[PDB]
Amino acid sequence: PIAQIHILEGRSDEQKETLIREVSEAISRSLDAPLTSVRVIITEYAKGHAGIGGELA
Amino acid sequence: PIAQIHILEGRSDEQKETLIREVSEAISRSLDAPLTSVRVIITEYAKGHAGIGGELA
Amino acid sequence: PIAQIHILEGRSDEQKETLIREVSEAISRSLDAPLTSVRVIITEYAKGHAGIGGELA
Amino acid sequence: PIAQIHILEGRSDEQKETLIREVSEAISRSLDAPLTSVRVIITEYAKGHAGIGGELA
Amino acid sequence: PIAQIHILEGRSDEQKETLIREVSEAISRSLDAPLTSVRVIITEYAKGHAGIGGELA
Amino acid sequence: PIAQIHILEGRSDEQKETLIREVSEAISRSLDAPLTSVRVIITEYAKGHAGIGGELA
């Protein structure tokens, strides 16, 4: 299983690796899949690259 | 935050309902973000549509 | 330019034909880009495959 | 609904913000969906990261 | 590395199995990365879910 | 046809130039589609943005 998470940029390296760890675990439990097969890729977006209603985020 | 999770087809609706929730909870936790802003998208793949080494899954 | 649009399933082919045309025009228009270079691909998601707060839509 | 737009880098911040506004509106009309539920995320690609026929763009 | 290939629907399982192997090897080849680390996922699109120039494919 | 390739950063431009050309050709053959219609986009991921076992890559 492969997860691509899209988030707003600005966060520390501290949280984003925890995210990888926390999300990978949730996939493994939910789908009874071995953790070693779970992939997480994070993509960050700049202020001018994210919209919520036609307006910037 | 937006999570697109790619999984092999074969799971029950029950399992996939758990996946969305557990992953959503993990994301809210990891990024101290309000849960109500978290979105999850599941995409299922048939075995003949997924490869691991050039070989099917 | 390539647009991947993620929507809940349930619309008619007509609405999706309108979506492709109207979104394509806006991209060509917004980026002063040739319309003929614009690609749009729609991905529909079943009700049990989309989350908003860890819960279904 | 969630729209992912993949574009070549080099354009100004002014053009990319208009895109979010205009693409969002197009989605809202085409699918008779409330505008505030529409999300847009822009991804730019360096010239050496985009192909049209096996050749760079 | 993860490859997501977006194609028009209508092709045989034979062609898509050929696609996965040939594309995986090309990636493993280009980047001197283990073939066994290569993942490929295919997503097919119906006539009414793909646009070029705002018109259906 | 569109290929989205997700790779870890650190490789040279010549390798990625090879990748786009080489991968584009593989898709064209496999699906007997004109090469000039094949498009490829590469997305690179930093050390802290990729997970494989819940641990960084």
Author numbering:
A (entry chain B), B (entry chain A), C (entry chain D), D (entry chain C), E (entry chain F), F (entry chain E): 1 to 57
Task: Show passages lifted from the paper.
The enzyme 4-oxalocrotonate tautomerase (4-OT) is composed of six identical subunits of only 62 amino acid residues each. Inspired by the versatile success of proline and its derivatives as organocatalysts, we anticipated and found the proline-based enzyme 4-OT to promiscuously catalyse carbon–carbon bond-forming reactions such as aldolizations and Michael-type additions.
To obtain insight into the structural consequences of the M45Y and F50A mutations, we determined crystal structures of mutant M45Y/F50A in an unliganded state and in complex with substrate trans-β-nitrostyrene (5a) at 2.7 and 2.3 Å resolution, respectively. The overall structure of the M45Y/F50A mutant did not reveal significant changes in backbone conformation compared with wild-type 4-OT. Hexameric Cα backbones of mutant and wild-type 4-OT superimpose with an average root-mean-square deviation of 0.32 Å. In the wild-type 4-OT structure, the side chains of Met-45 and Phe-50 point towards Pro-1, restricting access to a small hydrophobic pocket at the back of the active site. In the structure of mutant M45Y/F50A, the side chain of Tyr-45 is rotated away from Pro-1 towards the back of the active site, where it forms a hydrogen bond with His-6. Combined with the replacement of the bulky Phe-50 with an alanine, the M45Y mutation results in a significant opening and enlargement of the hydrophobic pocket near Pro-1. In conclusion, our results reveal that the two mutations (M45Y and F50A) unexpectedly created a new substrate-binding pocket. This active-site remodelling is most probably responsible for the observed differences in activity and enantioselectivity between mutant and wild-type 4-OT. The progress curves of these reactions demonstrate that this mutant, in addition to inverted enantioselectivity, also has significantly enhanced ‘Michaelase' activity for the addition of 3 to 5a, as well as 4 to 5a when compared with wild-type 4-OT.
